[PDB]
Structures are given as C-alpha cells and as structure tokens.
Design a protein around this ligand. Sequence first.
Ligand SMILES: NC(=O)c1ccc[n+]([C@@H]2O[C@H](COP(=O)([O-])OP(=O)(O)OC[C@H]3O[C@@H](n4cnc5c(N)ncnc54)[C@H](O)[C@@H]3O)[C@@H](O)[C@H]2O)c1
Ligand SMILES: NC(=O)c1ccc[n+]([C@@H]2O[C@H](COP(=O)([O-])OP(=O)(O)OC[C@H]3O[C@@H](n4cnc5c(N)ncnc54)[C@H](O)[C@@H]3O)[C@@H](O)[C@H]2O)c1
Ligand SMILES: O=S(=O)(O)C[C@H]1O[C@H](O)[C@H](O)[C@@H](O)[C@@H]1O
Ligand SMILES: O=S(=O)(O)C[C@H]1O[C@H](O)[C@H](O)[C@@H](O)[C@@H]1O
Lengths: 366, 365
Amino acid sequence: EAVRTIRYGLIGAGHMAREHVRNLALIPGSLITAVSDPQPSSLEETVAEIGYEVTTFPDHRELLVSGLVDALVIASPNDTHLDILKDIFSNQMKLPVLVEKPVCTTAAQADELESLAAGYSAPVWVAMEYRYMPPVQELIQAAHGGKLGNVFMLSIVEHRFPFLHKVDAWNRFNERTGGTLVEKCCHFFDLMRLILQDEPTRIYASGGHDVNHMDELYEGRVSDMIDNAYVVVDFKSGRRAMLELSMFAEGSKFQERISIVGDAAKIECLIPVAASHWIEGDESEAVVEFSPRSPLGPETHEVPVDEAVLAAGAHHGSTYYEHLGYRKAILGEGPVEVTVADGLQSVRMGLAAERSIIEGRPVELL
Amino acid sequence: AVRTIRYGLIGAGHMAREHVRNLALIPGSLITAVSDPQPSSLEETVAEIGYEVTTFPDHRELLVSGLVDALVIASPNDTHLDILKDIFSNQMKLPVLVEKPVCTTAAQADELESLAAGYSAPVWVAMEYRYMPPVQELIQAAHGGKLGNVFMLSIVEHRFPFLHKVDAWNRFNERTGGTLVEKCCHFFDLMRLILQDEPTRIYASGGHDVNHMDELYEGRVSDMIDNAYVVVDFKSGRRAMLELSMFAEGSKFQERISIVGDAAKIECLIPVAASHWIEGDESEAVVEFSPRSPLGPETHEVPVDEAVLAAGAHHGSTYYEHLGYRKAILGEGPVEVTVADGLQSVRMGLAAERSIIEGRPVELL
Ligand SMILES: NC(=O)c1ccc[n+]([C@@H]2O[C@H](COP(=O)([O-])OP(=O)(O)OC[C@H]3O[C@@H](n4cnc5c(N)ncnc54)[C@H](O)[C@@H]3O)[C@@H](O)[C@H]2O)c1
Ligand SMILES: NC(=O)c1ccc[n+]([C@@H]2O[C@H](COP(=O)([O-])OP(=O)(O)OC[C@H]3O[C@@H](n4cnc5c(N)ncnc54)[C@H](O)[C@@H]3O)[C@@H](O)[C@H]2O)c1
Ligand SMILES: O=S(=O)(O)C[C@H]1O[C@H](O)[C@H](O)[C@@H](O)[C@@H]1O
Ligand SMILES: O=S(=O)(O)C[C@H]1O[C@H](O)[C@H](O)[C@@H](O)[C@@H]1O
C-alpha cells in the first residue's frame, strides 16, 4: 500500500507529549519535524525521547509558519488550549489538530471555541482516548450491538493516585485545570455519551478536597482542587450513569472499573494500574466479564494488549489506536471520531458537576 | 441450664421460615406460637419447624395466649406498625424483633417514634446485613482505623426481581413504602453504621424500567422502582453512594461494598445465595484490603459455617442477628439495631423516593 509520511509538530513538550512521541514511533510514516515549548528543560527531555533531530521553537507561532508540518499535536496546560487553537484557526495553512483534553477550561472558553471551530475547515480531534482501550472497546461494542438488551445503567469507578507534579505546577488550581471533574473526568463524561448513545439532561455531584496536596504551598496557597467525588448523570432517554472518583485510592490493583447493566445482561471491565505506577513484576491483565441474566453463567476473559503498544504509554494501549485514527483523519481516509462537539459536552458536563458540588444542587444541561 | 426462650412468630411466610431455620441452630430456642391469616402459610411453616406448636389466625390471640417470652414479626411491611401498637398496649410487654422496614410512611414513622419511646421492652429492627461475616470485617477495619480517615462508601446491589409473595403484597409503593424503603433500608443503615455519622442530604435518580411489566392487577402494573443511584452526604463531610439493579441477577457477586480512607481501601464481594444460583457453582465471599503506601493488596475468602449459610439467604447474617436478639431478651446485652435506627433508614429511603420524584436533593435533620 505504501507508507505515506506525515510531518508532525508538537506544541507542548512535556509528559504527555513524550507519550505521543512513543506512540507515533510505533506507526510507520510518523515523522516529528517541529517541537515547541517555552521551557528548554522540557524540549531537551522530549528531543531525547524522539531520538532524532528536529527543529525546536520556544513559541508555537513560529512553528505554525515554519513550513515543516502537515499536522499538529497540542499537549500544553489545559488553559492554553483555546489560545493555541485560535492561532491555528487564523493561520493561513489550515492544519489538522489533535488537541489534548480538556479542549477548554471554562464556559466562556467553550462558547467562543464553539463558534470558531465550526468556521475551521481542517480536522480537529480532541484527544480523549479511553474508548480505544481494548477492554473498553469490547464494552462499547456489546452495548451498541444489543448484547445487553436495552441499556439502563452505566457505572465508572476510577481509584488512583494523586495528580502528579507538573511543569510550573500548572495542575494544582481550578483556575488553570477547569477543576478535577474537567481535567480528570472529561474522559468519563464522554464515555457516558458514547456508551449510552444519548445526551445528558441533569447532573448532580457530591465531592470535596479531603486528602491531597495539603503540604504543598504555591505562593502560600494550598491546592483548591477536588480529590474525590460521586456524580450522577441523567440522560434524555431515561438512562442513568454514575462516576466514582478517588485520587487517594492508588492501592487498588485495578484503577478503572466500568460496568453496564441492561435488561438482558450485565458487562464489566477491570483495567490494571499502568506498569510504571505499580510494583515491578506484579502486572495484572485487564479482564472483561459478561453476565447474562437468563441462563445463569458469567464468562470472564483477559483482554491482551500488544507488549510494545502497552509499554509506549500509561493508558492501556489507547494512545496508539488514537493515533491510528488521527492519521486516517489527516489523510482523509477516515473521520474525526472525537470532535470538538464531543469535547465541549464533556467540559460542560464537568463544569456542571463542579458547580453542583459547590452549590449543593443539581444542574440542568441544555 | 441454657435459659429457654419461647418464641412467637407473627407472620408465617418466607422470611419467617428463615427465622425458624436460624433459631433451630441456637440451643434454648423453642417456638411455641405462630400466627398468620393464611392457613397455607401456617402449614408450610409448621412443617419447617418440625415439632408441634400452637397456631393462631390473628396475632391478638397469640399475644394473650400465655405461651411466649419474645416475638418475631415477619408480616407485610404495611402491617408492622399495627402489630407493634397491639404489642405496645398488651398487658404482658414482650420483646420484639420486627422485620424491616419498621414502617412504610412518614406518618407511620412520626407515630412509631412517640409510641416506641414509651415501651419498656426491647424492640429490635431486623436489619441483619451488618452480621454478614465479610461486612463485619469491613466494619471493624473502618471503625478500627485500618483505613485512616474514612471518606467514601460505595454499595452495589445487583440482583433478581422481587419475588412473588402471598397476596402479591410487595408489588405497589402503597404497601411496601417503595423500593428504596423495602429493599434499601438495609443500605442506608449500613451507611450510618460504617461511617459513624448522620445523613444531611440525599439525592437519587431511579425508575421502573424493566420488571413486572407482564403482571397485571386489574390492568395495573407494579409502580415500584427497579434501579437507582443514590448519593448521601453526612454531617462530617463523608459521602456514600448506593447502586441498585433489580435486573442484574447474572452477576456472580450480588453485593459489592467498598470503603475508601486516606490510608487504605477495603472491599467485599458477597455471592448469590445457593438457592438462587446454579447448583454446584457457589462462590465464597472475598475481602480485599488495599493499602496506599506500600502497594500490595491482600485478598482472602471469608468462610461461613456450612449450616449457618444454608439456614438462610443472607450469607449467615440472620444467625448472628438471633444471637444478639437472644441476649437482649435475657437482659444480657443491648439492642444493636433500635427503632431509632429503623426510623432513620426509612426516612432516608422516603427522602430518596421524594428526590427521584421532585428531581432535587432532600435535606435530612
Ligand atoms: N489524554 C491523557 O490521557 C492525558 C494524560 C496526561 C495529560 N494530558 C493533558 O496533556 C496536557 C499536558 O499535560 P502534561 O502531563 O504533559 O504536563 P507537563 O507539565 O509535563 O507538560 C506541559 C508542558 O507544556 C509546556 N507549556 C506551558 N505553557 C505552554 C504554552 N503556552 N505553550 C506551549 N507549551 C507550554 C510546559 O513547559 C511543559 O513542557 C494537558 O492538557 C493535560 O490535561 C492528557
Ligand atoms: N430481613 C430480610 O433480609 C428479609 C428478607 C425477606 C423478607 N423480609 C421482610 O419480611 C416480611 C415478610 O416478607 P416475606 O418475604 O416473608 O413475605 P411472604 O409473603 O413470604 O410472607 C408474608 C406472610 O405474612 C402473612 N400476613 C399477611 N398479613 C398479615 C398480618 N396482618 N399479620 C400477620 N401475618 C400476615 C401472609 O399471610 C404471609 O404468609 C416483610 O417485612 C419483608 O420486608 C426481610
Ligand atoms: O496523573 S496526572 O498525570 O497528574 C493527570 C492525568 O492522569 C491521567 O493520565 C489522565 O488520563 C489525564 O487526563 C490526566 O491529565
Ligand atoms: O427477594 S425478595 O424476597 O422479593 C425481597 C426481599 O429480599 C431480600 O432478601 C432483602 O434482604 C429484603 O430486604 C427484601 O424485602
């Protein structure tokens, strides 16, 4: 068939950018030619990870007119996404974008992004990749395919470690992250829309900042972000979903549990902690359990992931399959599967959840 | 000399027969009197007791029979308060183990609260789940500090549709108090027990989505909820979530309870009762303790005595409930589940039903 070279530019050269790098290295015809980051420590580490020569820029505006790129990846702090997108949108080269979640951090940003994105002709993909985890993909196919009968309930449990230290401590305050239920939980709101094939009408949440980062001072201020919550989401069709989050439950062997209940069957998956975050040599595999109602007899199977695909990132192989899809979108050989529209809904959902917590009331979604 | 107790059973149906089988495992337990307005129920229950007793159609004659030291009530939910009132005004004041829910409406609860404070003899509300051996390990771990400061409690119940009962009593909200009372009082009460706190706010989303759509009473179908998510806030800032599906009987584990603190997480999985699962494929209950700091979860099976497990469908819990009630009858020990505990569980469930209906959280005092 012949591998077609795509020249990628990376705007933001931090932790997640380096994961993008390792996933692009598994995909023939993936050439990184330009990297931007205002911090040279980040560029040194990232160039080293790429392991071949590239052109670096401290500002993305020069990368955009460098003439070196066919497609962009944005992995900068959450509150910078809209501003970089605006510069891409007004650039005269119409370049495809894979923009990291959350696509934006406030309601004002979302209102503005919505108008600007509809006027842009090139593909814009929001990098919420969890659907591409092989076990999650099995649950989606089962739900969409009717293997559960009519679907009514969706539970998502994420039990994990506290937010990691980042460059300039950008992820410690709501003002830069959009809040925990945007930063961390947009993934889950979007899976709810995808799995249930419906739109949310009402969100209620209870949560707090109970445990984490109490001993970290940023100009004498303590982090204001949530570290645990319960969220209950209603949908137009009458389906209902629940998210449980703890950022202080890293002892849990399985970091994610997703369960779906229909009137014919239940299905569930358990996703292990990424090797880099768990005990060496105590690796569990992801499992899927299908539990029909009628002839009682559950079935459990492991869902293997290619060794190299799994080791290239910390999201159970998902970033690789995200890149296969984005590549196809760049070539015009496939559609954008996670759109700006999907991004905006996930953000508004998370924003509504944060407001619900703070004001002790459910929030309607329009 | 053990100390014999003569038990009277008011209500002689399915749960009464479980009470019977558990009492048969406890020396000094003699059933002498059974009451039930339906003779089919009495026949089946007498057969289960397997020795002669005196039967009555009405509990009022049982109460003055002279045959009893203590009572067990296992009648339909909406009859509890009326039987308790007759017990409360009886000349011989007898201890009562009254089945959940202790009552079905807010009017009943207001009335029960005043009447029960004026009654001198023990009244135990028979919410037994705390005595399931795996749940008891979770309670001790939470109370004992093994999790550090406790913040989160999740309870997931995935089970079969409500069973067919005598006179189809459990199909409408007006007789049951609604699903979040009938079925979920157990869970509201465990929340109060495990978190050692009082609720301030409750929110729920639920519907009647799947079950009993083909069972008709003059063209009317059951109006009861068959699935729900409930989120409960507590005075201290602790938070709990209950998930319920009455159409998820395919699940090998019927109950999942998890508790998260700032030092550790603990979780149990409770198997489906043998009588409701495939023969020969019974699973053991597991408890998993998951510390944060030295990564390294620990998993163990929690055995239950074979006869204790086979005597009931609540994983041995009814046995340990009866050990406690026995002590209360003898003046050897306190009532561990009081009427006050019953009322809180009911008002929690009633608030949850109102939350669903009004689309808003309901404040609790
Ligand atoms: N999809 C996922 O699974 C996933 C996982 C982690 C992070 N992310 C997202 O990736 C983004 C980056 O997070 P991270 O973990 O890489 O953090 P990081 O702190 O390791 O990297 C951020 C980098 O951006 C640079 N930067 C700061 N301001 C910039 C600007 N204006 N323009 C360009 N670069 C700028 C910083 O110098 C740093 O190198 C965020 O949106 C985060 O939410 C996504
Ligand atoms: N604690 C538990 O785990 C558990 C389990 C099952 C049932 N229960 C409770 O037990 C009670 C009975 O439920 P069940 O499953 O045994 O139902 P069932 O229908 O099997 O038995 C109920 C019995 O009560 C009798 N009855 C009806 N009206 C009566 C009255 N006025 N006085 C006396 N008896 C009367 C009926 O004739 C019938 O035999 C309910 O409160 C139910 O919620 C508790
Ligand atoms: O653990 S941190 O790196 O602090 C935070 C990150 O955690 C996961 O990777 C999520 O996918 C991601 O959305 C989030 O940005
Ligand atoms: O399955 S049914 O017998 O219809 C329903 C009953 O059964 C369960 O065991 C619960 O413990 C009990 O509280 C509830 O009333």
